[PDB]
Amino acid sequence: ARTMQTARKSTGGKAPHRYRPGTVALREIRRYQKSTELLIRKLPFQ
C-alpha cells in the first residue's frame, strides 16, 4: 500500500421566542381599531 511509497507520497484518499419590536404594537393597533369599548377606566375617571 501507500506505506511503501518512499517518494511522491500519494495523499489522495486519506486525511422562549420573542417577537421583533413593533409587531405586538401594530397588532394592538389592529385590535383596538376594530373595537369601540372604552379604554380609560371608569372609576379613576369618575
Add this chain to the structure above:
Amino acid sequence: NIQGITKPAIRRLARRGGVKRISGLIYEETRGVLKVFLENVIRDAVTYTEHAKRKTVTAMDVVYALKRQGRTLYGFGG
C-alpha cells in the same frame, strides 16, 4: 386622582389612534392636555347647572357644554 390614567391607559389610547412608538414624556403631556380639556368642558357644564339652579349636573349639561365647545356628541339625549 390625575395619576389614575397612566401606563397602559395612555398606551391603549395611542393604539386606537395608530401610534407605534411612544416616548416617555407623552404620558405627562397627555394628562395636561386632558386636564385642560376637562376643565373647559366641565366649566361650561357647571355654568348651565348654576343657571338652572341645581346641585346635580345632568347628562344634558355635559352634552350642551360639548355643543358649545364644538364637540357635538350623539347618544346621551336629544
